[PDB]
Each structure stands twice: as structure tokens, then as C-alpha cells.
Enzyme design. Structure first.
Site, PDB file in Angstrom:
ATOM      1  N   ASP A  69       0.799  -1.155   0.193  1.00 29.70           N
ATOM      2  CA  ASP A  69      -0.128  -0.039  -0.009  1.00 29.70           C
ATOM      3  C   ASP A  69       1.008   1.321   0.099  1.00 29.70           C
ATOM      4  O   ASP A  69       1.457   1.599   0.896  1.00 29.70           O
ATOM      5  CB  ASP A  69      -0.839  -0.013   1.154  1.00 29.70           C
ATOM      6  CG  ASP A  69      -2.195   0.896   1.107  1.00 29.70           C
ATOM      7  OD1 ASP A  69      -1.888   2.080   0.421  1.00 29.70           O
ATOM      8  OD2 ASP A  69      -3.230   0.654   1.612  1.00 29.70           O
ATOM      9  N   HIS A 108      -3.487  -0.246  -1.968  1.00 28.96           N
ATOM     10  CA  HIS A 108      -4.725   0.148  -1.385  1.00 28.96           C
ATOM     11  C   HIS A 108      -6.066  -0.334  -1.774  1.00 28.96           C
ATOM     12  O   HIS A 108      -6.899  -0.151  -0.940  1.00 28.96           O
ATOM     13  CB  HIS A 108      -4.510   1.943  -1.463  1.00 28.96           C
ATOM     14  CG  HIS A 108      -5.809   2.386  -0.336  1.00 28.96           C
ATOM     15  ND1 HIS A 108      -5.529   2.393   0.988  1.00 28.96           N
ATOM     16  CD2 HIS A 108      -6.839   3.027  -0.481  1.00 28.96           C
ATOM     17  CE1 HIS A 108      -6.332   2.817   1.688  1.00 28.96           C
ATOM     18  NE2 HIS A 108      -7.221   3.411   0.710  1.00 28.96           N
TER      19      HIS A 108
END
Ligand SMILES: *[C@@H](N)[C@@H]1CCCN1C(=O)[C@@H]1CC[C@H](COc2cc(C(=O)O)ccc2Cl)N1
Lengths: 726, 726
Positions: free
Chosen positions: B670, B702
Site C-alpha cells: 500500500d 490500497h
């Protein structure tokens, strides 16, 4: 009636095992400490005298995690501000206390962040490593001499091992060896210049805004390895003006031809040192015996005193070539080598004769040589009762190899079947350490006629406490597979009812030369499972297992991830049909290598196991270090063993995990079995649509041993096991 | 009876929603891509012809993922070798096809790994960024003109945004703006030289021996931010013998006094450009209106022609200052700004007038200006029925602000309460997109009389399928928290029985200016939970929520982690007392900001929730990017808002998790909400002795959106919710 051994008793260590850790300072006395003062004992009589009152350092200002009294008895090394690094390495702060004039030395003190320190074996000289360089102190209060000037973080290591050598060969951070009387200081130098770096995030305290990236020279399978050099410096020829001169001991040419390792260094005499080198293909090793040339200053190793040790069925040594034990004059020596029959026994060598004479033989193995006097050779083996998982001290007459006497077998057969020993300076006395199957028992003895002097600690305190609890029993037995017998052990719940069908947890490791079935007393997670959750916890040693001869141990040469996993499955298959095992509730778990086998087993599709837990597992051998991996797998090249490297991965078995319940656990700061290994496993399971449980431990390394993480991981695993079993 | 909307239907998208994405190429036509070929439609009659055959590129050798026809209709841009980067950025290979001579241009081709490409607004000029530098192609087969020579990976970005500008200000990778007739090319230049780098491991395919370390310039709260510069080059006077001369537009002086941002650029005429700047303390913004100086070759932004937009209650704009819409002569413009009453409405400006005039008002807000003609201003707002969660298209007569007409309100009141719109080049025609509460419905209209020309797509197919499945219903309503209305929505199970008591799941985001309670029709996880699992899935918009005026939205100003999580707790508390909720089975979950709020709620100690799932949650604001965090929190210094920065972390609330079942999930790759954030959460829970569930997703970012990870996370979470509620 009576309470059980709970998870909390295990996590809070409410039932402690008493130890008797002594330090021989001569052939007549030893040192013993409590949590306060250090007493000095007289082995013959048993009486003592305070060596230095605990008070001495009441206003030191720092917490002392360890002491080290010089061979002189004159000084004390104070170690504090302990900062752990890898498995054995760590940096700390040191201060020296002059015992004679009861005062702390404050002039020319040992630098902070010292990587390693060690007294000479006889006086009070000091050798320490700082910033990858070696320094020597002839007197604790006088300035030190810099022995080396090449140290460089993550590049050149002088006197200390780099990551792989600490972990896979020397099992130590130290890479220096004093000569018997301290005249010479030998050391190795590692160069990691071209060694790739493993990189991982370390998050640190919440306050750290940006995570830091840790990188360490780490050779994975087939990658570039660090190079090594060996030197010997004379600690009596160093001055302040002139820079000390280190004489290097190179070759052997048979080694310089390709990649190689320095695998052992052992001084024979004041002027004789033996070195053992290993080729990257750990099939062949060479031992050089080098002598100091007084009228030349250098060290020569006569090709005549050079001994070759190689193997055709596997690798050399249990993990590395065993070490030699020389006779006093240094003209001969004894060392454990594999039999023509495949059993490791003690062989006697004349330093200048290629062939050796085995002094012990039989279908059992010598674990290690413990002492050598002019008349006897003392050693530990598992010969007694033919059980591989037992240890006993023996002595053999050097004049009649037919005269072998067991010194610990009969002391207390019911309670003691596993021993370790600690001899005094001249083997005039020895301490026996029995650690199972009953509670640990420490005793003192005299070598003249092996008369038992007394009991040092019988753990009676712990014994009283335990009769108030329903403790589990341990069954050590065997099963036969293809004529060959393999041992196993079972931690049985209290009041074991052979009628009932208990769930079975298979605790496995199964790495090459491992032994999970023995007679050692243990208070651990398995104790809690059986005593409170009434779960049977078993362990089995199959192909690849050690201490049973090479036919069993070398069975997985160039083939990791095959027989050691298969036999693990065959074992529980036999266990389930024993009558008291619920074949519908059989689980399996393991750490590191045991995590690998656990995973390989769960993805085997045997249908035998319902669930399993893998902690810090290896998932594919190319991700692990070179020294260990290549020892059993060779090189991951098309010309060598690449095909099996690619065939023994956990991810190739992802689809089969659909039939089991899996728990994958790994510390994010694992410098040994990189998180990477579990990251690739989880990714393969995801890509195939297999649901599973996971848990990462931020900033924990291979042992996930921080006080809180340790309690949390076993608590987490306990819930998983109970859930799979209830 | 009947089947339900299962988890599999959601993961395998068994019930597909039909769309109608058209691309206006003029004021009368639009391109509509079939799965095979591209058709050109005439808006007036609806007749169509094949613009280019699907087989035209059979033996192209590459998979084409997108097209782009020059405003000329002369050339087509073929995009392939698409490689995604962040939320908007990516690189790809491009080929230009000549529609007239039907032939692929093979000379002076656009480089592979191009970061961005765009035609000019009127003919066939091209601008593209490669290796962070800008290039201009006047003709598709002619050599490019390099406009900039300072580009450098991770340091200098010419024509493209760096990580934070891409994600937090422009919501795009592009940082270049062609003037109306393509004569001028304006662009921004970002300098990330001193911006710290976030670093994390990327494991890649199984075959990667050593994990690679990714590092990207990422400013966390309070850290060094990138600097920016704006330039404008004339694309009609570039030689090939001389380097392009770019003219810089600096200041405002009130912005150069400290850190600032370029937040908007909108061209007004062929020779007038507008620029909006924002101070690092996003309290104050200034708009510059610069004019080209014919006989000087430069641009002048007369401080007098600049308009200031500031806020005393909070920050400026919903997420940033809105864009202006200039009139024909470029002398005046309309733009949404906050009312004196705190409601965002359209204000009419004169480029050289100090005070603007609001053309709309009321206790509701204009969502956005969609089109501006010399006659009318078309906009979307939530005025209708006083429902902030509704959206309708309106048009206000510029001659009489009294004559505002709603163009979508009555088309289909029961089925359509949420519209978005797409106008043709001169707003002669417009496509209305109804997305709820009923099935999405696409229609075409002509601006002249607002006649409904025809239905483009009515999802009659999906409707025939859904009629055979027990679908859930949505309740959209409000509760009153001390004098104010706060809306919420509920996905209710089929055959909802107000007397029975269902378990409730709180779906939460709650970040500033968010809105989770709307009239939008969706087929998602919640759909499955209600339909198959009979779980009520609610969402609530409390303090901080948007589109309801600043009093509500600015309520959490400088105070994230307070009012928005509290109100979340109150809503659940009030839902459990409505009579159809089992207060014993109430859960909460959220992603990113929703994960932060979920964690803060579960750590509040209210005990209202039995369990909660947090995916990619923020855990402490000093870990998130500056532009976003600082906009609401100010600076993390003692003089500013450091105290609250420390008072609002998730880890400080770890002790309160002992009473809940927590599932923490995060993709290891992420780049937005760094894994670090979850790593600290887990560490705090472990250090406090709290058991919880975890799951990392290796190499996922993400979105955790790869096909396999997406199906896996949702399958994993379903199991968690079923277990928690069963
Ligand atoms: C999670 N939502 C984290 C928590 C703090 C804010 N945040 C972000 O990711 C920020 C919020 C504003 C910016 C863009 O966010 C989005 C963009 C889009 C899009 O389609 O462009 C969709 C959804 C979001 Cl949250 N990043």
C-alpha cells in the site's frame, strides 16, 4: 483432584527449573553465583568462600547482565547495556574492576558498542572487536593496540563473523582464538563486498514517522558468498610505535580453486594450530596443521599433516566437520568421523599419517569428545540401551580400546538417561548434568576413580510444587518402517486412558540431523496442551533424522522436502491406528524447518491432517541462506540441482490447502527466515482461492521472543488448536 | 422459495449492470464503443455509422486497452503495454493511426514507457511526457520538440504530478493544460528533491530471490513538501535549431512567503489563464488571472485582478478551491464558494470586481457547475425534496436568477433521484445518468427545449433477472441529534419484518466531506449480506459529513478522530433501539478512513460493537500524507496542533480492544496508507495482551483489487462476520 499445568503457568514461568551453572577456574575450584554474590568452591570438600560480595556494585548506576572474571582472578569484566543483534551476536558496554585494589578502571576504557570481548586463557590480556576491528590490551588500565585497520560496516569483519558464518558455521559472533597460554591471537577476516543484501522494513516505536529499511549482507542459495582469510598475530611483539604484524595462513590450493569456507580452528599446542576448510560443495574438507617457525616468523602447514575428509553419500560432519582433540604433545589427535558403516565414531590420528584407527564402533553414535587425559578419553554417546535419544558419559582406555566404562548409565537409570558434562581444568573433577526423563539432577565427581562427591542440585523444590499438579507423562518408543526402526515420543495427558480417543498434535521440526524424540524433561507449550486440554503431543524422527547413522541422516541428500515430510505423514498414519487417537482430530505445527514440513504436509493432500500451524516457515529453498541450503541441496543451477529446488516449494502445493485449516505466522523483522518466505506462501494460497488464517508480528525476529509477542503467539495458537479440536 | 443475491454472485458478477459511456467529439456527435468496434452517433436523430472496424487492428501484435481520437477525427491514438502506477498514473506504449490514409505511422513514433499523452483541443497537435520531460509533436509523423530538459526520476516532474499532487490535489497524473485553440501549452513542474521517501518491500513473482525495496517521494504530515513552478510555452513558435523558451508565472507574493500549493489552473480565453494557489495552511487561497503580453512575450498577473478565498471556520473548498467557469469575453466567471451562512453556492464574478454576487441560495448546496452558455448556467445540486443524498440537474437563467428550472427532478421521481450529466461541446445536447434509487437509466436530451430525445440504456435486462431474486431494499432517512438532521441509509433484508431482530453491520467511511447515505443503487458486498445473510447494513453521515453546509462539515476542523467517530457510535446506539435490531450483534467495518474510524470506535470503550473489521486503516495522522492530513489537522508541531495529533491515534486505545473481536487487514504494497499504519496497531495490541485476527495481502496496494485478492478478502471478511453474528 489437583490442578493442571495451564497456559498461564507456561507463559509466566510459575514452575521454574533450578540450575547449577558453575565456572571452573582451576583443576580444584569453580565459581558459583546466585542472584547476588559469587562464591568460590572447593570441589574435593564442598566448602566455599565469598569471592566478591554482591554489594560491590550497588552504586554502579547500570544493570549488569553478565560478568567475566579473568583467568588471573585479578580482574572482572562487567557487561551492561546489552543490545541483542542476531542469534548469538550483540553489542554492549564494558567496564573492568580491579579486584586487588578494589577499584574501577577509568583510564583507556573499552569503547562503547564493543562487538566482542574475551580474556586471554591464562593471564589478564584482553582482545575486543570494535567497529569491525581488533584491539588488544596487555593491561586493563593501559592503552590498547589496534591489530587491524580494515574494518568496515557490512563489508569487512575482523575477529567477528558476518551474518551467515554466525548462523551456519561458527554458531558464534566471535571469530578469534587465543593460543593456550595467550601468546598468539588467531582470527578470521570476512569480506562481504559482493554479497547481496536482504532488505526489510523495521517500524520501531510509534514515534518514528518513516519506517527504516534494514539491510544486511545475506547470501541466499547460489548467490555470491563472503570470502575469508585467516591470520595469527603475536601479542607479545606489539608496541605503541609500530603496527602489529599479522601472519596470514592461506590455501589449501585444493580449496583456493573455487568457493570455500573456513569451518573450524583449534589450537593444538603453544605453537601448533589446526584449521579445517570446506568447499562450497560441502562434500570435501581439508585439515591443515600449521607450526610456528621461530627463525622465520611465519606459519607453515606441512602437506603431510594435512588430512582429507570427504563424503559420497552426503555432506561432511553433522553440520560441519567435527573438531579435533589433540594429545598434550600435539603429535596426535582424536575426532568424530563417519564410519565405513555410516556411524560417527572416534578416530585416532597421528598428525603425519593419512589413515586413522577407529577406537569406538557399533550401531550407535558418539555425540562429542569431552576430555582427554594421558590414560583416558571421555565422551558422550547414545549407546546405552540402544536408544538414540539418550546421552551418557563414557571413558575409554587409551591403552586398550576394549576397555570402555560408562560413568553415568547406572547412577540413576529411572530418572536419568540424558547427560552432559563439565570437567575441571585438568579433568581431575567433573559435573554431571542429567536433564531427563525425571527432573534435572546435578552432581560432582572425581576422575581418579569416578567417585560421586555429592549432589549439587536435585530440584527438590520444584518436585514439591509439581506433586500438586496433574502432570503429563512421556512415552518414548519406536515403530518400524521398511525394516528400519524410527523413534517417536508422546506427551500423554494425565490419567491417560488407552480406551478413549484423544486428539493428536504432531510437533515437528524434521530438519537434517534433528532429534525430536528424546529423554529430556521439558516444561513447555506441549505440557499445557496435554495437561489442561488433554491433547496428545507427538514428535517423530524419520529419514533425515540424526544420531542414527548416515543411512538415515543422508536419506534426504539433494532432496529436502521429500522423505522427511513423507515419514512425518506415515507416522501420524500409524499413530491414528494405535487405538487411542481420534483420526478425525489430528493437527501439525512447527517452527522454521518445522514450518516448512508442516506446510508441505498440509499441502500434500494426504487427508490425514485436519489443520496445522506454520511459524517462520521456509517456503522455497532459494530464499534461505547458502551455507545451510547448499549443504543439503547443492547449487540451484540447471547443471546441478535446480529441478528439485523448483520441485520442493510450498506454493506449488497451494491448491491442496483447500482440504485443511491453516494458520501462517511470521515476524516481519525475521533476519533468518525472511518474511518474504511467508509472503510468497500467502500469495500462492490467495491466487488459488484458499482461505486461511494469518498473523504477522511487527518488528519481531525469528524467535518472536519478546515477552509480549511470546505470550501473544502461544495464546493465539492455543485458540486455533482448541477450535480445530473442539 | 427463490434464490438470493449470494457472495458468489457478487464476486463473479452474475448480475451485470449495463452502462453507456459516450465520448462527445463535437456539439452534435459522440463516439460509442461496442465491445468490438467504435461507432459514431448523431445526437439529433440517433443514427450511427462505424467510425473504425474492430478488425482494423487484428495483426497489430498488441492488446489495445484504449483509444483516443484527435479532435480532428484525422488520427487515432492506440494505447497498449499499459502498466498501472498509483491511483491515476501509469505508463504505456502508443501508436498513431492515420484514419484518412488508414495507415499506422511508423516514423518519429512516441516512446515506450510514456507517462502521459494528450491531443491539443482543436487539431492534431500532441504533447506527451517521457522520462519526466515534455515533448510536442505538431504533426504525427514529424520529430518531437523537447520542451523541457530538467526531468529526473523521483526528483523533477515536468508535465506530470508527483505522488501527493496526483492523489491529493489534481486527482490525475497529468500536469499540463492546452489553451483553448492549442496555441499555448501550460504546465507545472514539481521538485521533490528534499521530500522524504517511503520505503517498503515488494516481493514480486516467486522467482525473485531477493525482495526489491520500493521508495517513493512521499511527504507525511509536517515533513518537507515538494515545491512547484508554473510555465507556459507557445507551441507555434518552436524551431528545431533552438531550445523551446518557457515563460514562468510565479507568485502571488502572499503565497511565496512560505510553503504553498498550485491547486487549480483553468484557461479563460486564448490569451488569459487563471491559476489558484493554496497556502500550506489551507486556510487561504488566491486566484491569479494572467494575461499574455503580445509585444513582450510574457505573462502578467496584475495583483488587483486576483481574488482571495479564505475560511475562518475551516479550510477552503470541499477538498480544494472549486474551478471557475469563464464567460465568452473572459471578463467574468461563476464559481462555487461557501455562503455567509456556510452553504456552498454559485457566485458571479467580474475579473476586476472585489465582491461577487450569489446567483443561488438556500439550505442546500450546489454540487458542481456542469456547463455554462451565454444563456444559461447548468448545475447539479441536492435541493430537490431537501435531500442532501439526492442529485439533480438544474439550469439558471443568467438574465433572471428567479428563473431556475430543474431538468431531472420529474423525469422519473420514484426511480431516479441521483443524476450526473455529460454535455456536448457547446451544451447543445446532454446525457443524463440516473444511478438510483432504481436501476441505472441513461437518456439523451437537447438543450434548446429540454426535450427527451431517447433512452440510451434502461437496464431492462438486469431488471428481468432481479425480479426473480429476493433482493434487499434501501431505507434512506434521518435522525435528529440536538437540533440537527443527520441522514443514514439501511440495506434491509428481503421480507423485512420490523418485529424480528436482525444483526446490524455499520458500513463506515466518515472522512471529511464524505456521504455514505444516498439514493444510489448498488450491487455490492452489503447487497449479499442483507439478501443471503439477513443482515442490516447501515451507514451514517454525522459531524464532518459533506454537502450539508460548513457548520456540519467544519465541525471536525483540527479535530479528526473525535466528532465523526462519536456520531458513528450514537447512530448505532439509536439503530439498536428502533425495534428491529439485535443489540447483541452489532458490528462495524470500514476501509482507509473507514478503517481508522472503525478502529477508533472499537477502541472507544463504548462496548456497543461486538466486532469490527478495519481494512487499510490510518492509525495516526503523522503517518499519512501532508496535503490531506494538514488540511484538517494543521501542523504537528507544539505551536500548532501536535497535541491532538497524539491524542487521536489508534494505538493509544489498544487496551479497550479487550472487549471486542478485531480483524485487521492491509495490503503490504500500500503506497497510500502504508502497511506501517497497521503494523503499529498490531504492535500496540500485542504489547497490551489483546487477541485479534489479522491478514496481510502480499504485493497488493490500497485497493486490494487484483481479481484473486478481491475475492479472497471479501470471502475472508464474510466468514468473520458470519462467525461474529452466529
Ligand atoms: C482513505 N480513504 C485515506 C484516509 C485518509 C484519506 N485517505 C485517502 O486515500 C485520500 C482522500 C482524498 C484522496 C483521494 O481519495 C479517493 C479518490 C478516489 C478516486 O476515484 O479518485 C476514490 C476514493 C478516494 Cl478515498 N486520498
Amino acid at each position: 483432584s489437583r490442578k493442571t499445568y495451564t497456559l498461564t503457568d507456561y507463559l509466566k514461568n510459575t514452575y521454574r527449573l533450578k540450575l547449577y551453572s558453575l565456572r571452573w577456574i582451576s583443576d580444584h575450584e569453580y565459581l558459583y553465583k546466585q542472584e547476588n554474590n559469587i562464591l568460590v568452591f572447593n570441589a574435593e570438600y564442598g566448602n566455599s568462600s565469598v569471592f566478591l560480595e554482591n554489594s560491590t556494585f550497588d552504586e554502579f548506576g547500570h544493570s549488569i547482565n553478565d560478568y567475566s572474571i579473568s583467568p588471573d582472578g585479578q580482574f572482572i569484566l562487567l557487561e551492561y547495556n546489552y543490545v541483542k543483534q542476531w542469534r548469538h551476536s550483540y553489542t554492549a558496554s564494558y567496564d573492568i574492576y580491579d579486584l586487588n585494589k578494589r577499584q574501577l578502571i577509568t583510564e583507556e576504557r573499552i569503547p562503547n558498542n564493543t562487538q566482542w570481548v574475551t580474556w586471554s586463557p591464562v593471564g589478564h590480556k584482553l582482545a575486543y572487536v570494535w567497529n569491525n576491528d581488533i584491539y588488544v590490551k596487555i593491561e586493563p588500565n593501559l592503552p590498547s593496540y589496534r591489530i587491524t585497520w580494515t574494518g568496515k560496516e557490512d563489508i569487512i569483519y575482523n575477529g567477528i563473523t558476518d551474518w551467515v558464518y554466525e548462523e551456519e558455521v561458527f554458531s558464534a559472533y566471535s571469530a578469534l582464538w587465543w593460543s593456550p597460554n595467550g601468546t598468539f591471537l588467531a582470527y578470521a577476516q570476512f569480506n562481504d563486498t559482493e554479497v547481496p543484501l536482504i532488505e526489510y522494513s523495521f517500524y520501531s516505536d510509534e514515534s518514528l514517522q518513516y519506517p527504516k529499511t534494514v539491510r544486511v549482507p545475506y547470501p541466499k542459495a547460489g548467490a555470491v558468498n563472503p570470502t575469508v582469510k585467516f591470520f595469527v598475530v603475536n601479542t607479545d611483539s606489539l608496541s605503541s610505535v609500530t603496527n602489529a604484524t599479522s601472519i596470514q595462513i592461506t590455501a589449501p590450493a585444493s580449496m583456493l580453486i573455487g568457493d570455500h569456507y573456513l569451518c573450524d580452528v583449534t589450537w593444538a599446542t603453544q605453537e601448533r594450530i589446526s584449521l579445517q576448510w570446506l568447499r562450497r560443495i560441502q562434500n570435501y574438507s581439508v585439515m591443515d596443521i600449521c607450526d610456528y617457525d621461530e627463525s622465520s616468523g611465519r606459519w607453515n602447514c606441512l602437506v603431510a599433516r594435512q588430512h582429507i575428509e570427504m563424503s559420497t553419500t552426503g555432506w561432511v560432519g553433522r553440520f560441519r566437520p567435527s573438531e579435533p582433540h589433540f594429545t598434550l604433545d600435539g603429535n596426535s589427535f582424536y575426532k568424530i568421523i563417519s564410519n565405513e558403516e555410516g556411524y560417527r565414531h572416534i578416530c585416532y590420528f597421528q598428525i603425519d599419517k593419512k589413515d586413522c584407527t577407529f577406537i569406538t564402533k557399533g550401531t550407535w553414535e558418539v555425540i562429542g569428545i569431552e576430555a582427554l587425559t594421558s590414560d583416558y578419553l571421555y565422551y558422550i554417546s547414545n549407546e546405552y540401551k540402544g536408544m538414540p535419544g539418550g546421552r551418557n558419559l563414557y571413558k575409554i582406555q587409551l591403552s586398550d580400546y576394549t576397555k570402555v566404562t560408562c560413568l553415568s548409565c547406572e547412577l540413576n537409570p529411572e530418572r536419568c538417561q540424558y547427560y552432559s558434562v563439565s570437567f575441571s581444568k585438568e579433568a581431575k573433577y567433573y559435573q554431571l548434568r542429567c536433564s531427563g526423563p525425571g527432573l534435572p539432577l546435578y552432581t560432582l565427581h572425581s576422575s581418579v576413580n569416578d567417585k560421586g562427591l555429592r549432589v549439587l542440585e536435585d530440584n527438590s523444590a520444584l518436585d514439591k510444587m509439581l506433586q500438586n499438579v496433574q502432570m503429563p507423562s512421556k512415552k518414548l518408543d519406536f515403530i518400524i518402517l521398511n525394516e528400519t526402526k524410527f523413534w517417536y515420543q508422546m506427551i500423554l495427558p494425565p490419567h491417560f486412558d488407552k480406551s478413549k480417543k484423544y486428539p493428536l498434535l504432531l510437533d515437528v521440526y524434521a530438519g537434517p540431523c534433528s532429534q525430536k524424540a528424546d529423554t529430556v524433561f521439558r516444561l513447555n507449550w506441549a505440557t499445557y496442551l496435554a495437561s489442561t486440554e488433554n491433547i496428545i503431543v507427538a514428535s517423530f524422527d524419520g529419514r533425515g533424522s540424526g544420531y542414527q547413522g548416515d543411512k538415515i541422516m543422508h536419506a534426504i541428500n539433494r532432496r529436502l522436502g521429500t522423505f522427511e515430510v513423507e515419514d512425518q505423514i506415515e507416522a501420524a498414519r500409524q499413530f491414528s491406528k494405535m487405538g487411542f487417537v481420534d483420526n478425525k482430530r489430528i493437527a501439525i505445527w512447527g517452527w522454521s524447518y518445522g514450518g516448512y514440513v508442516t506446510s508441505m504436509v498440509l499441502g500434500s493432500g494426504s487427508g490425514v491432517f485436519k489443520c496445522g500451524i506454520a511459524v517462520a516457515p521456509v517456503s522455497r529453498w532459494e530464499y534461505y541462506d547458502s551455507v545451510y541450503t547448499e549443504r543439503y541441496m547443492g547449487l540451484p543451477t540447471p547443471e546441478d540441482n535446480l529441478d528439485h529446488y523448483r520441485n520442493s516449494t510450498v506454493m506449488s502445493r497451494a491448491e491442496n490447502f483447500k482440504q485443511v485449516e491453516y494458520l501462517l505466522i511470521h515476524g516481519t523483522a525475521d533476519d533468518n527466515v525472511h518474511f518474504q518466505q511467508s509472503a510468497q506462501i500467502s500469495k500462492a494460497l490467495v491466487d488459488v482461492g484458499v482461505d486461511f488464517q494469518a498473523m504477522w508480528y511487527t518488528d519481531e525476529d525469528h524467535g518472536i521472543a519478546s515477552s509480549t509477542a511470546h505470550q501473544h503467539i502461544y495464546t493465539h495458537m492455543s485458540h486455533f488448536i482448541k477450535q480445530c479440536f473442539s
